[PDB]
Write a protein that binds this ligand. Structure first.
Ligand code: KAA
Ligand code: KAA
Ligand code: ATP
Ligand code: ATP
Lengths: 489, 489
């Protein structure tokens, strides 16, 4: 079976040895003057009669992907960064002996450099008549084809062969710096806040712990910059944002990765209603720049980011997707506990009325939110950093928004109430001691920072990785992350 | 003494309570239509005769910094994001009672919003004739002045008061996205590689360790993306870069921070000589855009980034700054060990000839490199990822470059030699077991990735934080990092 593959490994190493007993092995002096796209966008419209008479020399380098050897001439496909180009490897277009003694002896996946002139084949294809041809790196292993997880264990392979996957990560990088251009253009300053916090705060999840060996001190890997960005606002950086990693112990998932990219952005003298008018206007502007169209296919669905997003209260969503729901039960703890238990929810000792009304929303409405939707009016019990609402103080001015069943973003009117912020970190701590290992920590510092005066403000957080998925039609986070986290072996 | 300061804390809280028994406390509905800079760049050239007759209403919000109360009118300095502006708080320009019952009762540091029309005072200063005036957040603590380290423990204060410090962090953000515009313009793709590696590699330093609670797995906080960026090159991302954090256990320093920002950039089919022609051309382009001039003051020195950097071999630097040095001693281990011991160096059991020749360079020449300098020809023993040199294999094609006594950057021709890369990870491991806890780990994966073929390449790393220091004349890393790491209490 596949021991003529171990014939390949062996044979390549013996080749590499003899190159080494010459000096040829691993040279770095070759210089190319074009990539593959730059020849195609400059010369595809030209036919042979033009290209033969134009007589353009070019130098290129890449990974040899095919080789038909027709005798005294061959045909080599060279793949580099911008695609693939065609080589015409003639015996007597090369210097005496390169064709028979070097070119024939090279394997696929090897790195070659080529110099020659452009033309068009019988096909009409753009090809390089090679006149110098060089080996640049000996590939000791041959190109693959397997496992569906090789693409994550060895992403270098998936980038070489799959082009969906390659153009996905080129769209990712366009997206990231398209978000920035939009965020600056609005007047925001990209800051860098610490990824090693000593008290982790700003979201509700289990952090990674590490020990600083020079200060006897245990640090945490931040679960959000939220507490620290809000410090900068008090400082008078009144339009800050930060697109960077964060770290949560959540398991390896298809909506989760223990390290993931998130933007957070805070805007002074503005309320959450202004964060909607930017979430909407962002996703429209990203859809237009990345895709040329407000309308975006994703899975079996199509989303229209030109069209305004749907918007419901949390209670509206429940009574919409569970219409038999006696809405009075969201008002009394025992009735809410019973209601939650009846639809499957296991209500914990550490749950109060708003958490039950939330965990019931989570059951009943969430995955049904498929067109982009905002869900406003979150309970206070679950939103320890959001402002309280003016007409009803047991609910915050906080929206989460959803596209296709997942939470993308989370924003709210911010809590510029020092004292109330302290007492809500108390409830979180009372909550951890009741058995909630995702409760917050009391950040005695952040509470001080508020006492110095935090201007009324509203802030937003948006999972970039989830959003990268929407614009590349990828359905696992492990497909928009270059090196996604592995369950090992 | 300072118990009329605890009179201030008490008095502010009692104020905030009575606002709360009204509803006024923490409103968020105020909207401003200008910041302070936008009034100054639009109306400073105008005199009163123009501004009185133009009659421009404006709304602004900020932190009240001063208040002269002259009786039936006052003068208030309002500081917001873009600077400070002047308010003319008249009694009868405000709605009945705001002046006597609200405006007088507000403290400094409070967040007010103001609406009014522009004019010029007797001074000729640009001021707002207030006609609506509102309290937006009650500051429970008053503005400071202390300790020289408060600026790092509570950076929100240092941004409010010190303006050197504020404009330093605004220059930082201009620098970061000026590097990107220059890096893209050259044709590089900003990627995101994992900050949680399972085998940390790519530099020589002690990493942070953490445990992933869902996979029984111990992760490390990456000390560089170097191993992973080079994977992406093999994939055919032949121009990648990444400006992001990394993490080392190094102590809290003035050239170090346990988390710090670094760019790394890899370029296919190019050698380290091409990384110089970009280090030079970067620092020139950054000096020109950030400062308007190729010449940069820093400390007692002045650097000229228009002028080409000085360049020495490692041995040239030694024999220049220790001219009596018998250069034959850099060739024999025992003579090099004796030479090192004589200038103070304590040579370890795990040191070979090149490490001694390096640690001797480190003693003898390094801090004398003040004008921007390149130091080429590093020994192999200390450069496990660099390519070997063609004429002498015991030295790599690796330069480190220095400005003003510190190492800024580190680049080299990259090692596209699979087998040699494996045997050099062996020496590193033999080295850890000899007593070097900054030796590398054998990354059995990275070795495979090379076997698939790494095109000849050259890569560079540049400490951004150190470089931010050069362009803001700041001399501690703790002054270009928003929240620098604290020795606690
Ligand atoms: N001041 C407004 C709130 C700002 C952000 C807030 N502090 C926060 O972190 N909210 S969140 O709901 O925890 O996260 C925002 C987004 O992060 C994304 N996220 C969270 N955990 C992960 C994981 N594990 N992988 C990928 N993406 C993730 C997801 O899209 C969330 O909607
Ligand atoms: N392939 C070329 C090499 C690329 C970079 C290489 N892997 C590397 O990390 N080299 S380095 O010398 O370790 O770091 C580059 C710069 O990082 C900076 N650095 C390193 N540690 C710290 C700390 N602790 N604080 C601040 N800046 C730091 C410093 O400017 C170094 O010159
Ligand atoms: N205490 C909890 N009990 C049950 N499920 C929970 C709890 N906390 C979080 N989850 C669930 O964990 C999953 C992770 O979902 P997701 O990351 O999209 O957002 P989330 O509900 O806001 O959580 P987080 O606070 O981790 O961001 C969700 O299905 C979420 O409801
Ligand atoms: N094994 C060692 N023995 C003595 N000093 C060392 C050793 N390793 C690093 N140092 C010193 O630690 C300090 C940290 O310096 P710096 O961060 O500027 O660059 P470096 O010498 O290349 O180290 P690193 O590998 O940590 O980046 C330097 O003064 C450096 O020489």
């Amino acid at each position: 079976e596949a021991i003529d593959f171990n014939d390949e490994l062996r044979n390549r190493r013996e080749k590499l040895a003899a190159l080494r007993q010459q000096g040829v092995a691993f040279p770095n002096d070759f210089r190319r003057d074009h990539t593959s796209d730059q020849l195609h966008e400059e010369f595809d419209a030209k036919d042979n009669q033009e290209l033969e008479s134009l007589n353009i020399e070019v130098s290129v380098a890449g990974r040899m992907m095919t080789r038909r050897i027709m005798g005294k001439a061959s045909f080599v496909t060279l793949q580099d960064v911008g695609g693939r180009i065609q080589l015409y490897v003639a015996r007597d277009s090369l210097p005496e002996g390169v064709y028979n003694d070097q070119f024939k002896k090279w394997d696929l996946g090897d790195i070659i450099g080529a110099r020659g002139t452009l033309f068009k084949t019988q096909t009409g294809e753009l090809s390089i008549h090679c006149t110098e041809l060089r080996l640049l790196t000996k590939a000791l292993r041959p190109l693959p084809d397997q496992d569906q997880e090789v693409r994550y264990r060895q992403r270098y392979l998936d980038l070489i062969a799959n082009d969906k996957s390659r153009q996905t990560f080129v769209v990712r990088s366009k997206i990231l710096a398209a978000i920035r251009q939009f965020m600056v253009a609005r007047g925001f300053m990209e800051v860098e806040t610490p990824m090693m916090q000593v008290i982790p705060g700003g979201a509700s999840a289990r952090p990674f712990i590490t020990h600083h060996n020079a200060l006897d001190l245990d640090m945490y890997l931040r679960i959000a910059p939220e507490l620290y960005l809000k410090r900068l606002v008090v400082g008078g950086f009144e339009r800050v944002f930060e697109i960077n990693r964060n770290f949560r112990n959540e398991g390896i998932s298809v909506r989760h990765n223990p390290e993931f990219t998130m933007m957070e952005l805070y805007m002074a003298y503005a309320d959450y209603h202004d964060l909607i008018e930017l979430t909407e206007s962002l996703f429209r502007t990203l859809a237009q720049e990345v895709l040329g169209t407000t309308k975006v296919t994703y899975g079996e669905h199509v989303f229209d980011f030109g069209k305004p997003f749907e918007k419901l209260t949390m209670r509206e969503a429940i009574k919409k997707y569970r219409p038999e729901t006696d809405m009075a039960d969201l008002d009394n703890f025992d009735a809410a506990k019973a209601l939650a238990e009846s639809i499957g929810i296991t209500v914990e000792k550490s749950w109060g009325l708003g958490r039950i009304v939330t965990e019931i929303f989570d059951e009943v409405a969430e995955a049904h939110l498929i067109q982009p939707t905002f869900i406003t009016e979150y309970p206070a019990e679950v939103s320890p950093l959001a402002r309280r609402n003016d007409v009803n103080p047991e609910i915050t001015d906080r929206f989460e928004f959803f596209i296709g069943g997942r939470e993308i973003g989370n924003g709210f009117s911010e809590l510029n109430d020092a004292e109330d912020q302290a007492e809500r970190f108390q409830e979180q701590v009372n909550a951890k001691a009741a058995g909630d290992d995702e409760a917050m920590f009391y950040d005695e510092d952040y509470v001080t920072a508020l006492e110095y005066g935090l201007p009324p403000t509203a802030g937003l957080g948006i999972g970039i990785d989830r959003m990268i998925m929407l614009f590349t039609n990828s359905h696992t986070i492990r497909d928009v992350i270059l090196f996604p986290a592995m369950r090992p072996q």
